[PDB]
Amino acid sequence: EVFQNETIKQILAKYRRIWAIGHAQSVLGWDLEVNMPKEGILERSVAQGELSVLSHELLLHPEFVNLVEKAKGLENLNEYERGIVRVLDRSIRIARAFPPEFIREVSETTSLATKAWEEAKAKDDFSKFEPWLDKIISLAKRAAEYLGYEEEPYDALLDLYEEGLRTRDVEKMFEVLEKKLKPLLDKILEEGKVPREHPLEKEKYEREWMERVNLWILQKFGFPLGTRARLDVSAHPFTTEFGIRDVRITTRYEGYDFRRTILSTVHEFGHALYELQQDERFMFTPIAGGVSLGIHESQSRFWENIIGRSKEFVELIYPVLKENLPFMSNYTPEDVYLYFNIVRPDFIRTEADVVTYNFHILLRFKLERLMVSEEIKAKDLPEMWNDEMERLLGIRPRKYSEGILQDIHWAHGSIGYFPTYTIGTLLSAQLYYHIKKDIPDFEEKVAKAEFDPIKAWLREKIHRWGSIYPPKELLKKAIGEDMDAEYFVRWVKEKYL
Amino acid sequence: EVFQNETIKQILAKYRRIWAIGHAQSVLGWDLEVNMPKEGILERSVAQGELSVLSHELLLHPEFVNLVEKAKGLENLNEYERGIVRVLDRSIRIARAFPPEFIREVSETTSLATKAWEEAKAKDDFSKFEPWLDKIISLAKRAAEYLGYEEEPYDALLDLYEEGLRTRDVEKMFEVLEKKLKPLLDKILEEGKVPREHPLEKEKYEREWMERVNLWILQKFGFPLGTRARLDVSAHPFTTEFGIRDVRITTRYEGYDFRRTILSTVHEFGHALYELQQDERFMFTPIAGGVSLGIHESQSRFWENIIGRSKEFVELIYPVLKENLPFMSNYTPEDVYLYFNIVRPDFIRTEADVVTYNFHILLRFKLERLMVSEEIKAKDLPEMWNDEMERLLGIRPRKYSEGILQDIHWAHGSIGYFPTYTIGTLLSAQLYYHIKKDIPDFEEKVAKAEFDPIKAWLREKIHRWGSIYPPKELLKKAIGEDMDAEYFVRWVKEKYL
């Protein structure tokens, strides 16, 4: 029916083995974080390693690659079948762009590099990690050559984490944020409307109190708990898809600052819904699943910030908070909303509010570009970081852990990854104004917990296409236009001005 | 030091891949029963199926079997290395004894027969499963021929589930039970020093109360919770080995008859300890792990019955029962002992006490042997089944559900499996008498919760050797004698007369 070409079918049967191995990995990883007694790590680690090598092997097997090149040349394929070919053609090209010994080198350098990152952080001493960063930079440039770019070295790595993304796209979006968000940010600070801190940040809670709250929210979102999804606790919130009918999320309960576990939970719901709403006809195939990190982030941010931080959502949840949190007797829905919408320039990215958040990513983009496209030395980075930080947020890191040693990303050799976060942020606001024209009383829906029509809109515009189309093609198909940072600027204004 | 020969090294390097899939399969299996949202079943299923086809493909991969064959020719291997050859050789032989087309047929009939068995049992109508039973009887005989045997066709199937076991051995242990255990049973029954029932069977409890008791006990045994083991809930209690350093067990809380959840937990702990105490130098190798179902059963029965139902255990447990179970206010520790040692002839095997238990297995042994040996029609089994019941236990099933339609085993095609349960039961008593002359104050240690020396003895004698030696050679090594049913008879006599 959907897949009827004889070659496409042969490709799909061979792919089921690859898919299967992926299902095992997802469970292995999920379990690692959620149930695995600590000493099970070693054996768990070797099993994952072995599986990773196996799947790569299968992906590059001459029979599988050849079948794909053959289908690539067929003229009678339907759009779904063409999706399969497109997706695999790209995975195969990336999977074989790096030589086997280069992959070996990157694996070895990064492992030591991260061990050195942890050392440098524990000693608030950058010199420990410095020499290893220079070796990562060098590898990042070799990597760019391997994938090959066609404009600028940094394009190759940007494309690696967000298919089709070019340095121009990122440059332009941030160019817009510097001319409009920045002054917008400075006015909100002096303005006053929203605070830089809130006492609710300090209120304590017992685990049980907040998990009831989280469970309440998910139920109202219509999360298929026990049926097609689960909620668990782990060290770091994430989402994992075992299948279209088995998507799991996790959150953590710090024991204070309850906004954290909520928005974190809603954030993951955003990702999970994308996977839950995949076209079941695509089950077991390469076109089922979110297309990119950028698009996935647009979904998590849509739910977390476009909805999770709105007054209607706050109003919708308020009675539940009051019902489970004793200290809530002293706070009104206005308190909570202000608490949910704190704007405050600070050092830690993961701590950043939605208005200052992107500038953190903007700084990483700037440095990363210079590192891969130019010839900078690791020793000069920490100071560049602090200058950009002061220039954008008006604060200068006083400790390495407050600046360049925040994230391990560069230590994992993950260069060109960061801008995907801003992509999610901007796209969230952009989708906001688009769903708004099909659902003008969007806010009323949130207040009344009538999320079905919102979820089905996301489903028909984004989720259902899985990976049939690359990110840019997918976005134009959903809203008829390219990504544009202007929408985010409007959202912040409308939000705080 | 353990693995030195080049060929064995090559065999092990390749086996890690196979080992890795088993690790994955174990996680998928465990998760399916413990956490998986019900609708995840379809995708988990094809994932498991694809993996089994994979592991089976690697076990018979040309370059692998070849190496195993070469290793089999060598003459200077040490016991550990010879063990790797023996185990792998057995697997490979069984893996290719059946033609791919005979596996389909077997798989087709099986599910079809299991489905019919399902309804036939629900409706107490044997005629619906009868024809399927005849077909299975035919597959069993055909399996036998493919596998080979020297004495009787049944040896082939018996050896299929327990390396080295032969009809002659099973018949020998059952003759002892028929001639000595039988009159002991009748004497125990006619005397009634132990009841056929106890009010503690109807007392209700809430899961929280019993999970505490279960944990307290496991803690007392020194169960490495959070470190190298876990305890969770599932439909049927079971033990799963992810790795030497990650062994998990499950139990169920019926909600009443608290003896069930306790003995179930200890039962699985018996299996867990065995795996937990494997020689870490064998990690990732075919020689790590319990050698056979039968030996594994001896370990669960050892803790469950030898320790679990002893009076020393009841005394140790008594105070924990008094504090977590309000209804215990009306019972003395004797009551608990009596409750734990109920003896009564019943129709259902899974509910049989330790004395009448082996008789349920004995009758299945008799019918299975005649089935695979002579020309029996499925239509004659029900009545043969009931006569045995009446002969051995003095009761006769009234409905098909209370008789031959009891378990799925035959529907699934598991012929030659049942006797392993008896081996486990007999072996546990044999080890009991042996551990007592090394640890004369064995009982006193149970009462005081000093299990380390007991576990250490178990480690030195059985666990440590993994699959290095076949079941029988292993026992000869550890106990200096062969499987002898006389010990169980003695144990029952010592316990109840």
XYZ file of N, CA and C in Angstrom, chain B residues 47-160:
342
model
N 11.041 -6.055 17.667
C 12.419 -5.753 18.039
C 13.061 -7.036 18.594
N 12.356 -7.713 19.494
C 12.853 -8.958 20.075
C 13.026 -10.026 18.996
N 12.061 -10.097 18.083
C 12.142 -11.076 17.018
C 13.361 -10.862 16.134
N 13.577 -9.620 15.717
C 14.716 -9.303 14.865
C 16.036 -9.604 15.571
N 16.086 -9.390 16.880
C 17.314 -9.646 17.623
C 17.631 -11.139 17.733
N 16.602 -11.954 17.941
C 16.798 -13.396 18.041
C 17.304 -13.944 16.725
N 16.797 -13.395 15.627
C 17.242 -13.837 14.317
C 18.698 -13.436 14.174
N 19.044 -12.304 14.774
C 20.405 -11.809 14.694
C 21.344 -12.708 15.487
N 21.114 -12.812 16.792
C 21.988 -13.637 17.619
C 22.135 -15.056 17.060
N 21.059 -15.594 16.491
C 21.098 -16.940 15.911
C 21.968 -16.961 14.663
N 22.020 -15.827 13.977
C 22.798 -15.691 12.755
C 24.301 -15.584 13.065
N 24.633 -14.917 14.169
C 26.021 -14.740 14.598
C 26.590 -16.019 15.206
N 25.739 -16.774 15.894
C 26.163 -18.022 16.516
C 26.534 -19.045 15.442
N 25.882 -18.966 14.289
C 26.178 -19.889 13.200
C 26.973 -19.220 12.068
N 27.462 -18.008 12.309
C 28.245 -17.332 11.280
C 29.445 -18.218 10.956
N 29.723 -18.430 9.661
C 30.837 -19.265 9.196
C 32.167 -19.101 9.934
N 32.625 -17.861 10.066
C 33.888 -17.591 10.732
C 33.872 -17.882 12.225
N 32.685 -17.988 12.810
C 32.609 -18.254 14.243
C 32.639 -19.750 14.545
N 31.755 -20.501 13.892
C 31.700 -21.938 14.109
C 33.058 -22.557 13.766
N 33.675 -22.040 12.715
C 34.979 -22.510 12.287
C 35.972 -22.423 13.443
N 36.049 -21.250 14.067
C 36.964 -21.056 15.184
C 36.655 -22.016 16.321
N 35.371 -22.202 16.613
C 34.968 -23.120 17.676
C 35.406 -24.540 17.338
N 35.344 -24.888 16.055
C 35.754 -26.212 15.609
C 37.253 -26.367 15.772
N 37.997 -25.327 15.406
C 39.450 -25.362 15.524
C 39.824 -25.524 16.991
N 39.154 -24.765 17.850
C 39.410 -24.812 19.281
C 39.114 -26.198 19.834
N 38.122 -26.858 19.250
C 37.724 -28.185 19.697
C 38.818 -29.212 19.400
N 39.634 -28.924 18.391
C 40.705 -29.830 18.023
C 41.943 -29.725 18.894
N 42.180 -28.549 19.471
C 43.340 -28.319 20.326
C 43.404 -29.337 21.468
N 44.594 -29.543 22.027
C 44.765 -30.522 23.102
C 45.375 -29.984 24.399
N 45.719 -28.704 24.434
C 46.335 -28.135 25.629
C 45.518 -27.093 26.383
N 44.230 -26.976 26.081
C 43.397 -25.980 26.753
C 43.210 -26.281 28.239
N 43.040 -25.244 29.053
C 42.819 -25.450 30.484
C 41.307 -25.639 30.701
N 40.891 -26.014 31.911
C 39.470 -26.260 32.161
C 38.532 -25.107 31.804
N 38.963 -23.876 32.049
C 38.126 -22.728 31.731
C 37.898 -22.650 30.225
N 38.970 -22.824 29.455
C 38.898 -22.760 27.998
C 38.139 -23.943 27.411
N 38.291 -25.116 28.017
C 37.592 -26.295 27.522
C 36.110 -26.038 27.731
N 35.805 -25.329 28.810
C 34.433 -25.007 29.118
C 33.834 -24.135 28.034
N 34.602 -23.169 27.536
C 34.090 -22.297 26.486
C 33.767 -23.103 25.240
N 34.629 -24.061 24.917
C 34.401 -24.891 23.751
C 33.145 -25.754 23.937
N 33.028 -26.433 25.076
C 31.873 -27.292 25.312
C 30.545 -26.556 25.187
N 30.398 -25.468 25.937
C 29.168 -24.700 25.903
C 28.830 -24.221 24.496
N 29.756 -23.531 23.847
C 29.498 -23.037 22.501
C 29.119 -24.152 21.547
N 29.824 -25.272 21.662
C 29.575 -26.431 20.816
C 28.128 -26.937 20.983
N 27.668 -27.016 22.229
C 26.312 -27.473 22.514
C 25.302 -26.543 21.847
N 25.438 -25.242 22.098
C 24.544 -24.251 21.511
C 24.493 -24.375 19.996
N 25.662 -24.424 19.379
C 25.745 -24.532 17.935
C 25.080 -25.804 17.420
N 25.210 -26.909 18.155
C 24.606 -28.170 17.726
C 23.090 -28.083 17.756
N 22.566 -27.549 18.849
C 21.136 -27.398 19.030
C 20.599 -26.324 18.094
N 21.418 -25.319 17.824
C 20.996 -24.244 16.941
C 20.749 -24.752 15.522
N 21.540 -25.716 15.067
C 21.349 -26.210 13.714
C 20.826 -27.632 13.567
N 20.254 -28.192 14.627
C 19.727 -29.554 14.550
C 18.413 -29.588 13.782
N 17.678 -28.480 13.828
C 16.385 -28.389 13.160
C 16.415 -27.543 11.903
N 15.944 -28.108 10.777
C 15.898 -27.424 9.485
C 15.055 -26.160 9.617
N 15.418 -25.092 8.896
C 14.625 -23.864 9.012
C 13.115 -24.055 8.800
N 12.731 -25.032 7.982
C 11.313 -25.273 7.721
C 10.636 -26.024 8.859
N 11.420 -26.732 9.665
C 10.837 -27.453 10.787
C 10.619 -26.478 11.941
N 11.355 -25.369 11.927
C 11.224 -24.345 12.960
C 9.965 -23.510 12.729
N 9.607 -23.308 11.460
C 8.404 -22.549 11.115
C 7.217 -23.341 11.620
N 7.120 -24.572 11.128
C 6.050 -25.491 11.490
C 5.879 -25.492 13.003
N 6.985 -25.696 13.712
C 6.977 -25.737 15.164
C 6.458 -24.427 15.736
N 6.878 -23.317 15.148
C 6.440 -22.018 15.632
C 4.970 -21.755 15.297
N 4.531 -22.244 14.143
C 3.154 -22.064 13.710
C 2.189 -22.839 14.594
N 2.403 -24.146 14.672
C 1.586 -25.039 15.484
C 1.515 -24.544 16.922
N 2.687 -24.269 17.477
C 2.816 -23.807 18.851
C 1.889 -22.667 19.240
N 1.948 -21.564 18.502
C 1.100 -20.426 18.828
C -0.349 -20.815 18.590
N -0.598 -21.511 17.488
C -1.948 -21.956 17.183
C -2.467 -22.888 18.284
N -1.619 -23.810 18.737
C -2.004 -24.748 19.788
C -2.184 -24.044 21.128
N -1.327 -23.067 21.393
C -1.398 -22.321 22.641
C -2.698 -21.538 22.686
N -3.112 -21.024 21.530
C -4.350 -20.264 21.467
C -5.537 -21.177 21.755
N -5.536 -22.348 21.129
C -6.610 -23.308 21.335
C -6.596 -23.761 22.791
N -5.398 -24.004 23.325
C -5.244 -24.446 24.707
C -5.887 -23.413 25.626
N -5.677 -22.144 25.286
C -6.214 -21.017 26.037
C -7.740 -21.140 26.168
N -8.437 -21.249 25.044
C -9.888 -21.370 25.107
C -10.322 -22.692 25.725
N -9.729 -23.788 25.258
C -10.063 -25.106 25.778
C -10.039 -25.087 27.303
N -9.033 -24.435 27.879
C -8.912 -24.353 29.335
C -9.979 -23.460 29.954
N -10.238 -22.322 29.322
C -11.235 -21.395 29.839
C -12.616 -22.035 29.870
N -12.934 -22.815 28.841
C -14.242 -23.456 28.736
C -14.304 -24.883 29.267
N -13.228 -25.350 29.890
C -13.206 -26.710 30.415
C -13.601 -27.724 29.352
N -13.146 -27.478 28.128
C -13.438 -28.361 27.001
C -12.153 -28.829 26.326
N -11.714 -30.030 26.694
C -10.491 -30.623 26.172
C -10.488 -30.897 24.667
N -11.662 -31.182 24.105
C -11.774 -31.507 22.686
C -11.232 -30.434 21.750
N -11.137 -29.205 22.244
C -10.655 -28.102 21.424
C -9.124 -28.035 21.348
N -8.452 -28.594 22.349
C -6.990 -28.598 22.376
C -6.455 -29.955 21.935
N -7.283 -30.986 22.069
C -6.883 -32.340 21.718
C -6.136 -32.524 20.394
N -6.721 -32.096 19.261
C -6.011 -32.277 17.988
C -4.680 -31.544 17.906
N -4.580 -30.403 18.580
C -3.329 -29.666 18.587
C -2.320 -30.467 19.399
N -2.777 -31.061 20.498
C -1.882 -31.856 21.330
C -1.303 -32.992 20.489
N -2.133 -33.621 19.661
C -1.631 -34.711 18.830
C -0.526 -34.225 17.894
N -0.716 -33.054 17.283
C 0.285 -32.490 16.373
C 1.588 -32.197 17.111
N 1.473 -31.654 18.319
C 2.649 -31.351 19.117
C 3.391 -32.645 19.443
N 2.643 -33.690 19.791
C 3.244 -34.986 20.110
C 4.089 -35.440 18.923
N 3.585 -35.156 17.730
C 4.272 -35.513 16.503
C 5.544 -34.672 16.324
N 5.483 -33.380 16.649
C 6.671 -32.531 16.521
C 7.730 -33.006 17.521
N 7.297 -33.299 18.743
C 8.205 -33.763 19.779
C 9.029 -34.949 19.280
N 8.357 -35.967 18.757
C 9.047 -37.151 18.245
C 10.002 -36.792 17.105
N 9.588 -35.862 16.253
C 10.422 -35.449 15.133
C 11.640 -34.659 15.617
N 11.452 -33.885 16.682
C 12.537 -33.098 17.248
C 13.569 -34.093 17.751
N 13.080 -35.106 18.460
C 13.926 -36.145 19.016
C 14.839 -36.725 17.941
N 14.246 -37.158 16.834
C 15.002 -37.740 15.736
C 16.070 -36.801 15.189
N 15.745 -35.518 15.062
C 16.715 -34.541 14.565
C 17.882 -34.413 15.545
N 17.549 -34.342 16.828
C 18.532 -34.195 17.894
C 19.429 -35.411 18.123
N 18.840 -36.602 18.065
C 19.595 -37.821 18.290
C 19.479 -38.294 19.729
N 19.753 -39.574 19.947
C 19.694 -40.179 21.275
C 20.232 -41.590 21.142
N 20.645 -42.196 22.250
C 21.184 -43.553 22.191
C 20.224 -44.582 22.791
N 19.564 -44.208 23.884
C 18.629 -45.098 24.569
C 17.191 -44.959 24.069
N 16.507 -43.903 24.507
C 15.112 -43.635 24.127
C 14.956 -42.218 23.564
N 13.984 -42.013 22.663
C 13.729 -40.705 22.050
C 13.612 -39.585 23.092
N 13.043 -39.917 24.246
C 12.856 -38.944 25.309
C 14.174 -38.378 25.848
N 15.268 -39.124 25.710
C 16.553 -38.626 26.200
C 16.923 -37.351 25.468
N 16.595 -37.309 24.180
C 16.880 -36.158 23.338
C 16.238 -34.879 23.846
N 14.971 -34.963 24.225
C 14.241 -33.790 24.690
C 14.677 -33.384 26.089
N 14.917 -34.386 26.925
C 15.365 -34.178 28.289
C 16.726 -33.455 28.238
N 17.612 -33.943 27.372
C 18.940 -33.350 27.221
C 18.810 -31.943 26.647
N 17.736 -31.701 25.906
C 17.508 -30.390 25.309
C 17.340 -29.315 26.379
